[PDB]
């Protein structure tokens, strides 16, 4: 079956066949679309088929499908599974796997970069301190003094579900949040609960507005341990405006390395519960969401005041005006400090090219419109006008419950 | 099953059961989501009619009454005898209001119950249609204090006597392909603008020429008519700070009136049912003015603002967009024409959503269409999970007439 996708701005029409290889569910039925819903131990039985599918994809990618090497590997894996219930990926299959999980991530607008990924193999790791060392190396490599390089660190896969490796932080680098008795919040509201766990675990919080959280690492299913990231490895950017000299006095700054660390990476049926990955920021992530979401730093008013905008009536679009300037400030500050960043216009334009390329060479590109379209100036970016098809391909990155909700303390 | 919807900004959670009454398909499947795709017999009729009458009588607290039963049998006998039936005025009004209530792509449904319904089922000719339309335009415009309304022409019979308004909106601007290769006016209507020519209209070849109505009655060929200019309210667009803005020579009409959709009530199909409410600022300022395939004006305004358009990262497009939208809203409010900004509109929709969830068990909503084309996340609906599904009565899309008409 063929599925047509049309861009109402260019009239360009694409044909998708890739969706035929989609196995996982979407949450939608023939009667209801849950497209805007944020989030709607395996047995030997369902393992080999998943392994076989993957290896077939892998060997086909290297143009060795059906080869003796291909058949031996399948037999090798089958034996290993039956013999140990699981199996180990070869270094090459791991790299191929990680890259495709990224390639298949429908909510990522930066996928034009999918093939350029530095994969750090941390499968020999056994302790929390070991995890800390691998993570410090990832941050330094990826940061590269501001010339960011995409990378992912992969810790030991899940076995029986009782020896999981986990990075309790949602991002390797993020600011602490503290609830005050008066009901207000100091820092980032998004990280309040995790911050409380850190404090409870022994972290001495400096209680500021931008305190870099400590890493809480869980190795081999044991209780998590606290580690502070060497400050010299944490690249930050003070935020100032190119025309508003008072902007700098707002006291805003942000970290340069976005590193999601709470997702699960699935490759050939294997589950890697600790797989922190990083690329570089698209401006709006910080300027629109982290700074202006009512439930985050929420700086729209304070910025609007300084600009002395008519905040009496929404129809003045004061919020909209303050929003643009703040985003101008983020992009300007990063570029001035020579820290990699991309604006939403460039990022979306590149994605369209990537997407068209993918339909031609791969037969499709699963994409989540709700997530791909930027949180500001939506329709003046090409993706808004692009019809998309969302489906799940493996390997892939998945959500997983926060560890503090499932962990059995020792 | 009982689905839940969460707002990630307020944590509020709502349970939806109304979806369990959905009957039509969404276009999606367990394997693929097409949420962003713009457009994914007597035996057939009675069940549809029955479903409708049951909800009608249920709404009037007479479910399972003799009146209910009587009407059910009357329509039943009517369908069996005439292969169709006629809705009572009360059922027609309830149907139209609910089709609006069920329009998952409309952000202004908090106004759903306040709709003026013009019964034009006695219309027989194009002239009659022009008269009814003129009256609708005048009633809804109301000197600037816009009032929502819909005019319902005769329902389909054998598909060969369909009533159709060929325009896509009662009031729109023409578009012409110039020698330059460029487009004069609104590119979105270039094709229709030509069918009017190809039919007789004397286009003024201007940038903002109000198109002529092309009305089709009883399947006959469509006819042209000029809407009395005195009835077409327009707003000159100026900025409340950039005196140079007026020189751009921009203006827009005050009455948004979709006229190419199909109203379905109790199985019956009303192929000519123009409806109007009032504009949300962004529709004109963001989409009609800045869409690359529309008036695409960002640059001109950008140049006149003298900002660095060398690098996309200066966000000149974003700055310019905001101003163009401040101007539209300013111009309308200044001339006293009803208009709502995206902030106020989305706030009201969230309130409506909450009312709907506690009173009807849900509210079908299309997130892709509900979230404004600008400042998405600073409006509440961005953070609101929504469930999209189809409920009848409903407003549906339908093929353009010139692709089906047999002259
Ligand atoms: C090179 C620069 C990259 C850019 C500019 C980019 C941009 C983005 C943005 C803007 C989002 C949405 C973030 C949000 O709303 O929270 C996103 C999500 C995502 N990206 Fe990328 N990305 C990049 C690199 C990567 C890399 C290296 C990977 C994986 C190896 C990746 C995996 C994903 C995934 C899985 C998501 C969804 C996360 C979630 O559900 O919260 N991205 N990306
Ligand atoms: C009172 C003011 C109203 C406001 C502020 C409002 C606003 C909107 C907006 C912003 C859209 C999206 C327009 C687009 O992107 O093309 C829309 C679509 C729609 N509205 Fe409303 N609306 C109002 C009244 C009405 C009325 C009176 C009806 C029906 C009787 C209605 C039925 C619909 C339908 C069916 C659509 C989708 C049309 C399509 O698919 O192109 N609206 N409305
Ligand atoms: C409810 C809705 O799904 C939610 O607010 C989504 C919308 N689009 C998004 N898009 C991106 N990139 N990131 C997000 O966190 C969200 N949040
Ligand atoms: C391809 C995509 O569905 C398309 O551009 C949609 C997106 N959201 C929209 N939302 C509204 N209100 N109106 C539109 O015309 C669109 N166009
Ligand atoms: N660009 C990326 N990945 O490289 N973003 C990841 C999520 C970051 C998150 N949106 C933030 O603002 O912190
Ligand atoms: N607000 C309404 N209806 O009341 N919009 C209907 C479609 C109008 C279309 N979006 C335009 O900008 O012309
Ligand atoms: Zn869907």
PDB file of N, CA and C in Angstrom, chain B residues 150-211:
ATOM      1  N   UNK B 150     -25.644  31.151   9.584  1.00  0.00           N
ATOM      2  CA  UNK B 150     -25.512  30.159   8.526  1.00  0.00           C
ATOM      3  C   UNK B 150     -26.823  30.184   7.751  1.00  0.00           C
ATOM      4  N   UNK B 151     -26.721  29.995   6.446  1.00  0.00           N
ATOM      5  CA  UNK B 151     -27.886  29.978   5.576  1.00  0.00           C
ATOM      6  C   UNK B 151     -27.878  28.592   4.948  1.00  0.00           C
ATOM      7  N   UNK B 152     -28.964  27.857   5.144  1.00  0.00           N
ATOM      8  CA  UNK B 152     -29.068  26.493   4.636  1.00  0.00           C
ATOM      9  C   UNK B 152     -30.005  26.379   3.438  1.00  0.00           C
ATOM     10  N   UNK B 153     -29.429  26.076   2.283  1.00  0.00           N
ATOM     11  CA  UNK B 153     -30.202  25.923   1.060  1.00  0.00           C
ATOM     12  C   UNK B 153     -30.758  24.496   0.975  1.00  0.00           C
ATOM     13  N   UNK B 154     -31.573  24.187  -0.054  1.00  0.00           N
ATOM     14  CA  UNK B 154     -32.151  22.842  -0.189  1.00  0.00           C
ATOM     15  C   UNK B 154     -31.165  21.674  -0.167  1.00  0.00           C
ATOM     16  N   UNK B 155     -31.585  20.587   0.474  1.00  0.00           N
ATOM     17  CA  UNK B 155     -30.778  19.376   0.609  1.00  0.00           C
ATOM     18  C   UNK B 155     -30.700  18.575  -0.692  1.00  0.00           C
ATOM     19  N   UNK B 156     -29.624  17.809  -0.827  1.00  0.00           N
ATOM     20  CA  UNK B 156     -29.404  16.980  -2.005  1.00  0.00           C
ATOM     21  C   UNK B 156     -30.522  15.959  -2.197  1.00  0.00           C
ATOM     22  N   UNK B 157     -30.809  15.657  -3.457  1.00  0.00           N
ATOM     23  CA  UNK B 157     -31.846  14.700  -3.828  1.00  0.00           C
ATOM     24  C   UNK B 157     -31.221  13.523  -4.577  1.00  0.00           C
ATOM     25  N   UNK B 158     -31.085  13.666  -5.890  1.00  0.00           N
ATOM     26  CA  UNK B 158     -30.497  12.626  -6.723  1.00  0.00           C
ATOM     27  C   UNK B 158     -29.089  13.034  -7.143  1.00  0.00           C
ATOM     28  N   UNK B 159     -28.523  13.999  -6.428  1.00  0.00           N
ATOM     29  CA  UNK B 159     -27.181  14.450  -6.744  1.00  0.00           C
ATOM     30  C   UNK B 159     -27.086  15.213  -8.049  1.00  0.00           C
ATOM     31  N   UNK B 160     -28.183  15.267  -8.798  1.00  0.00           N
ATOM     32  CA  UNK B 160     -28.184  15.994 -10.061  1.00  0.00           C
ATOM     33  C   UNK B 160     -28.920  17.328  -9.955  1.00  0.00           C
ATOM     34  N   UNK B 161     -29.361  17.664  -8.745  1.00  0.00           N
ATOM     35  CA  UNK B 161     -30.066  18.917  -8.504  1.00  0.00           C
ATOM     36  C   UNK B 161     -29.517  19.567  -7.242  1.00  0.00           C
ATOM     37  N   UNK B 162     -28.205  19.464  -7.077  1.00  0.00           N
ATOM     38  CA  UNK B 162     -27.512  20.019  -5.923  1.00  0.00           C
ATOM     39  C   UNK B 162     -27.381  21.531  -5.985  1.00  0.00           C
ATOM     40  N   UNK B 163     -27.504  22.173  -4.829  1.00  0.00           N
ATOM     41  CA  UNK B 163     -27.324  23.612  -4.744  1.00  0.00           C
ATOM     42  C   UNK B 163     -25.868  23.762  -4.311  1.00  0.00           C
ATOM     43  N   UNK B 164     -25.148  24.679  -4.943  1.00  0.00           N
ATOM     44  CA  UNK B 164     -23.749  24.888  -4.606  1.00  0.00           C
ATOM     45  C   UNK B 164     -23.323  26.337  -4.786  1.00  0.00           C
ATOM     46  N   UNK B 165     -22.525  26.827  -3.841  1.00  0.00           N
ATOM     47  CA  UNK B 165     -21.945  28.158  -3.924  1.00  0.00           C
ATOM     48  C   UNK B 165     -20.531  27.788  -4.378  1.00  0.00           C
ATOM     49  N   UNK B 166     -20.136  28.260  -5.561  1.00  0.00           N
ATOM     50  CA  UNK B 166     -18.824  27.946  -6.129  1.00  0.00           C
ATOM     51  C   UNK B 166     -17.655  28.655  -5.455  1.00  0.00           C
ATOM     52  N   UNK B 167     -17.925  29.808  -4.857  1.00  0.00           N
ATOM     53  CA  UNK B 167     -16.870  30.533  -4.166  1.00  0.00           C
ATOM     54  C   UNK B 167     -16.458  29.637  -2.974  1.00  0.00           C
ATOM     55  N   UNK B 168     -15.309  29.912  -2.371  1.00  0.00           N
ATOM     56  CA  UNK B 168     -14.838  29.114  -1.244  1.00  0.00           C
ATOM     57  C   UNK B 168     -15.233  29.884   0.020  1.00  0.00           C
ATOM     58  N   UNK B 169     -15.445  31.188  -0.150  1.00  0.00           N
ATOM     59  CA  UNK B 169     -15.883  32.095   0.915  1.00  0.00           C
ATOM     60  C   UNK B 169     -16.764  33.130   0.194  1.00  0.00           C
ATOM     61  N   UNK B 170     -17.851  33.545   0.842  1.00  0.00           N
ATOM     62  CA  UNK B 170     -18.773  34.511   0.248  1.00  0.00           C
ATOM     63  C   UNK B 170     -18.020  35.743  -0.203  1.00  0.00           C
ATOM     64  N   UNK B 171     -17.019  36.142   0.573  1.00  0.00           N
ATOM     65  CA  UNK B 171     -16.218  37.313   0.255  1.00  0.00           C
ATOM     66  C   UNK B 171     -14.739  36.937   0.220  1.00  0.00           C
ATOM     67  N   UNK B 172     -14.139  37.067  -0.960  1.00  0.00           N
ATOM     68  CA  UNK B 172     -12.725  36.773  -1.174  1.00  0.00           C
ATOM     69  C   UNK B 172     -12.161  37.656  -2.293  1.00  0.00           C
ATOM     70  N   UNK B 173     -10.840  37.751  -2.368  1.00  0.00           N
ATOM     71  CA  UNK B 173     -10.195  38.560  -3.390  1.00  0.00           C
ATOM     72  C   UNK B 173      -9.734  37.699  -4.564  1.00  0.00           C
ATOM     73  N   UNK B 174      -9.778  38.274  -5.760  1.00  0.00           N
ATOM     74  CA  UNK B 174      -9.384  37.548  -6.958  1.00  0.00           C
ATOM     75  C   UNK B 174      -7.871  37.454  -7.105  1.00  0.00           C
ATOM     76  N   UNK B 175      -7.442  36.525  -7.948  1.00  0.00           N
ATOM     77  CA  UNK B 175      -6.028  36.342  -8.204  1.00  0.00           C
ATOM     78  C   UNK B 175      -5.820  36.139  -9.691  1.00  0.00           C
ATOM     79  N   UNK B 176      -4.854  36.847 -10.269  1.00  0.00           N
ATOM     80  CA  UNK B 176      -4.593  36.712 -11.698  1.00  0.00           C
ATOM     81  C   UNK B 176      -3.130  36.423 -11.986  1.00  0.00           C
ATOM     82  N   UNK B 177      -2.895  35.540 -12.953  1.00  0.00           N
ATOM     83  CA  UNK B 177      -1.540  35.185 -13.369  1.00  0.00           C
ATOM     84  C   UNK B 177      -1.079  36.273 -14.338  1.00  0.00           C
ATOM     85  N   UNK B 178      -0.005  36.976 -13.992  1.00  0.00           N
ATOM     86  CA  UNK B 178       0.508  38.040 -14.848  1.00  0.00           C
ATOM     87  C   UNK B 178       1.616  37.574 -15.797  1.00  0.00           C
ATOM     88  N   UNK B 179       1.958  38.406 -16.800  1.00  0.00           N
ATOM     89  CA  UNK B 179       3.008  38.073 -17.772  1.00  0.00           C
ATOM     90  C   UNK B 179       4.316  37.787 -17.044  1.00  0.00           C
ATOM     91  N   UNK B 180       4.646  38.668 -16.103  1.00  0.00           N
ATOM     92  CA  UNK B 180       5.851  38.546 -15.290  1.00  0.00           C
ATOM     93  C   UNK B 180       6.012  37.105 -14.818  1.00  0.00           C
ATOM     94  N   UNK B 181       4.888  36.401 -14.721  1.00  0.00           N
ATOM     95  CA  UNK B 181       4.904  35.028 -14.255  1.00  0.00           C
ATOM     96  C   UNK B 181       4.445  35.056 -12.811  1.00  0.00           C
ATOM     97  N   UNK B 182       4.459  36.259 -12.247  1.00  0.00           N
ATOM     98  CA  UNK B 182       4.042  36.496 -10.873  1.00  0.00           C
ATOM     99  C   UNK B 182       2.520  36.435 -10.785  1.00  0.00           C
ATOM    100  N   UNK B 183       1.989  36.630  -9.582  1.00  0.00           N
ATOM    101  CA  UNK B 183       0.546  36.598  -9.372  1.00  0.00           C
ATOM    102  C   UNK B 183       0.032  37.921  -8.817  1.00  0.00           C
ATOM    103  N   UNK B 184      -1.062  38.410  -9.389  1.00  0.00           N
ATOM    104  CA  UNK B 184      -1.651  39.658  -8.929  1.00  0.00           C
ATOM    105  C   UNK B 184      -2.849  39.309  -8.054  1.00  0.00           C
ATOM    106  N   UNK B 185      -2.863  39.829  -6.832  1.00  0.00           N
ATOM    107  CA  UNK B 185      -3.964  39.547  -5.930  1.00  0.00           C
ATOM    108  C   UNK B 185      -3.716  38.327  -5.062  1.00  0.00           C
ATOM    109  N   UNK B 186      -4.779  37.578  -4.779  1.00  0.00           N
ATOM    110  CA  UNK B 186      -4.684  36.381  -3.946  1.00  0.00           C
ATOM    111  C   UNK B 186      -4.449  35.126  -4.780  1.00  0.00           C
ATOM    112  N   UNK B 187      -3.229  34.567  -4.721  1.00  0.00           N
ATOM    113  CA  UNK B 187      -2.881  33.362  -5.478  1.00  0.00           C
ATOM    114  C   UNK B 187      -3.814  32.178  -5.200  1.00  0.00           C
ATOM    115  N   UNK B 188      -4.363  32.127  -3.988  1.00  0.00           N
ATOM    116  CA  UNK B 188      -5.255  31.039  -3.595  1.00  0.00           C
ATOM    117  C   UNK B 188      -6.515  30.930  -4.448  1.00  0.00           C
ATOM    118  N   UNK B 189      -6.915  32.032  -5.073  1.00  0.00           N
ATOM    119  CA  UNK B 189      -8.131  32.030  -5.876  1.00  0.00           C
ATOM    120  C   UNK B 189      -7.913  32.175  -7.376  1.00  0.00           C
ATOM    121  N   UNK B 190      -6.654  32.126  -7.798  1.00  0.00           N
ATOM    122  CA  UNK B 190      -6.329  32.273  -9.207  1.00  0.00           C
ATOM    123  C   UNK B 190      -7.268  31.470 -10.095  1.00  0.00           C
ATOM    124  N   UNK B 191      -7.438  30.193  -9.777  1.00  0.00           N
ATOM    125  CA  UNK B 191      -8.297  29.313 -10.562  1.00  0.00           C
ATOM    126  C   UNK B 191      -9.757  29.761 -10.608  1.00  0.00           C
ATOM    127  N   UNK B 192     -10.343  30.028  -9.443  1.00  0.00           N
ATOM    128  CA  UNK B 192     -11.734  30.472  -9.376  1.00  0.00           C
ATOM    129  C   UNK B 192     -11.865  31.810 -10.088  1.00  0.00           C
ATOM    130  N   UNK B 193     -10.882  32.683  -9.877  1.00  0.00           N
ATOM    131  CA  UNK B 193     -10.875  34.003 -10.493  1.00  0.00           C
ATOM    132  C   UNK B 193     -10.961  33.891 -12.011  1.00  0.00           C
ATOM    133  N   UNK B 194     -10.484  32.773 -12.546  1.00  0.00           N
ATOM    134  CA  UNK B 194     -10.505  32.547 -13.984  1.00  0.00           C
ATOM    135  C   UNK B 194     -11.837  31.986 -14.463  1.00  0.00           C
ATOM    136  N   UNK B 195     -12.461  31.147 -13.642  1.00  0.00           N
ATOM    137  CA  UNK B 195     -13.738  30.549 -14.004  1.00  0.00           C
ATOM    138  C   UNK B 195     -14.824  31.616 -14.035  1.00  0.00           C
ATOM    139  N   UNK B 196     -14.588  32.715 -13.331  1.00  0.00           N
ATOM    140  CA  UNK B 196     -15.543  33.810 -13.323  1.00  0.00           C
ATOM    141  C   UNK B 196     -15.363  34.535 -14.644  1.00  0.00           C
ATOM    142  N   UNK B 197     -14.106  34.665 -15.056  1.00  0.00           N
ATOM    143  CA  UNK B 197     -13.783  35.315 -16.320  1.00  0.00           C
ATOM    144  C   UNK B 197     -14.400  34.453 -17.406  1.00  0.00           C
ATOM    145  N   UNK B 198     -13.942  33.210 -17.434  1.00  0.00           N
ATOM    146  CA  UNK B 198     -14.403  32.206 -18.376  1.00  0.00           C
ATOM    147  C   UNK B 198     -15.931  32.140 -18.405  1.00  0.00           C
ATOM    148  N   UNK B 199     -16.564  32.843 -17.472  1.00  0.00           N
ATOM    149  CA  UNK B 199     -18.014  32.859 -17.376  1.00  0.00           C
ATOM    150  C   UNK B 199     -18.616  34.220 -17.719  1.00  0.00           C
ATOM    151  N   UNK B 200     -17.800  35.271 -17.684  1.00  0.00           N
ATOM    152  CA  UNK B 200     -18.302  36.594 -18.021  1.00  0.00           C
ATOM    153  C   UNK B 200     -17.793  37.772 -17.201  1.00  0.00           C
ATOM    154  N   UNK B 201     -17.505  37.539 -15.926  1.00  0.00           N
ATOM    155  CA  UNK B 201     -17.036  38.597 -15.036  1.00  0.00           C
ATOM    156  C   UNK B 201     -15.978  39.504 -15.666  1.00  0.00           C
ATOM    157  N   UNK B 202     -16.053  40.796 -15.358  1.00  0.00           N
ATOM    158  CA  UNK B 202     -15.106  41.779 -15.876  1.00  0.00           C
ATOM    159  C   UNK B 202     -14.128  42.167 -14.777  1.00  0.00           C
ATOM    160  N   UNK B 203     -13.117  41.330 -14.579  1.00  0.00           N
ATOM    161  CA  UNK B 203     -12.112  41.560 -13.550  1.00  0.00           C
ATOM    162  C   UNK B 203     -11.408  42.909 -13.666  1.00  0.00           C
ATOM    163  N   UNK B 204     -11.308  43.648 -12.548  1.00  0.00           N
ATOM    164  CA  UNK B 204     -10.648  44.957 -12.512  1.00  0.00           C
ATOM    165  C   UNK B 204      -9.125  44.810 -12.444  1.00  0.00           C
ATOM    166  N   UNK B 205      -8.656  43.565 -12.387  1.00  0.00           N
ATOM    167  CA  UNK B 205      -7.223  43.278 -12.321  1.00  0.00           C
ATOM    168  C   UNK B 205      -6.523  44.030 -11.191  1.00  0.00           C
ATOM    169  N   UNK B 206      -7.176  44.110 -10.034  1.00  0.00           N
ATOM    170  CA  UNK B 206      -6.593  44.795  -8.891  1.00  0.00           C
ATOM    171  C   UNK B 206      -5.997  43.810  -7.902  1.00  0.00           C
ATOM    172  N   UNK B 207      -5.322  44.317  -6.879  1.00  0.00           N
ATOM    173  CA  UNK B 207      -4.710  43.456  -5.871  1.00  0.00           C
ATOM    174  C   UNK B 207      -5.744  42.942  -4.868  1.00  0.00           C
ATOM    175  N   UNK B 208      -6.806  43.717  -4.654  1.00  0.00           N
ATOM    176  CA  UNK B 208      -7.864  43.331  -3.724  1.00  0.00           C
ATOM    177  C   UNK B 208      -9.251  43.523  -4.327  1.00  0.00           C
ATOM    178  N   UNK B 209      -9.607  42.696  -5.303  1.00  0.00           N
ATOM    179  CA  UNK B 209     -10.919  42.798  -5.931  1.00  0.00           C
ATOM    180  C   UNK B 209     -11.878  41.762  -5.375  1.00  0.00           C
ATOM    181  N   UNK B 210     -12.962  42.228  -4.765  1.00  0.00           N
ATOM    182  CA  UNK B 210     -13.962  41.319  -4.223  1.00  0.00           C
ATOM    183  C   UNK B 210     -14.551  40.507  -5.377  1.00  0.00           C
ATOM    184  N   UNK B 211     -14.421  39.191  -5.292  1.00  0.00           N
ATOM    185  CA  UNK B 211     -14.934  38.304  -6.324  1.00  0.00           C
ATOM    186  C   UNK B 211     -16.451  38.312  -6.401  1.00  0.00           C
TER     187      UNK B 211
END
